[PDB]
Amino acid sequence: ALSPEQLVLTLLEAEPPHVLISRPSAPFTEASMMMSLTKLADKELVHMISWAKKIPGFVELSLFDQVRLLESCWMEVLMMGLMWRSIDHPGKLIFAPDLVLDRDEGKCVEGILEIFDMLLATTSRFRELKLQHKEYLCVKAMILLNSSMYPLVDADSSRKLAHLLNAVTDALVWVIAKSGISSQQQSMRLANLLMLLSHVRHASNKGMEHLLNMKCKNVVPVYDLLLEMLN
């Protein structure tokens, strides 16, 4: 019922506000960097819930589907936003306006350097394709809707998710068509962008494993909303 441009513009107005975390005055330790990253993720998780509720048709899903989709996608959605903030800054991860981290700063936390390279490499892939802003809005919405496997054969949830995922796909094809590039380039661009969803999923899985390990080693504490999403 909503036009592709109307969906893209609705996603634009639904963008969450910037989260203001700051680099601590004391130099970074393994516990302090993990504390800053987890605190940022917890604050961003609040805005993601409000953002997801503004995606057209999301609130029409059952409460079970809403929690299940957000439970499986929250790490991918946060990392996708980080890649967008860092798309024009090679070798740096723009976690926040006042939390800019260099690649070598990942040596402060054991095992996180590999994830930093994964996030930076996928960011470089989006930069090489010159990922436009409106393309980013569609991709990030696709991540939430394509997070939990819902085969058509709750059956109503898989059907609604298919209609929702189809609508955002129509929006993304429309943004790519507005560039005026050839039809062969349009299909190629759609393919290259959507293949990168697997790289975002891969970064999320390794980041999920790392965060669960940091909690197991009692390095970072996990509290409130972030804890619920980890359970």
Partner: peptide, 9 residues
């Protein structure tokens, strides 16, 4: 999921 249910309603 107390907070998530609350933030969703």
């Amino acid at each position: 999921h107390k907070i998530l249910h609350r933030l969703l309603q």
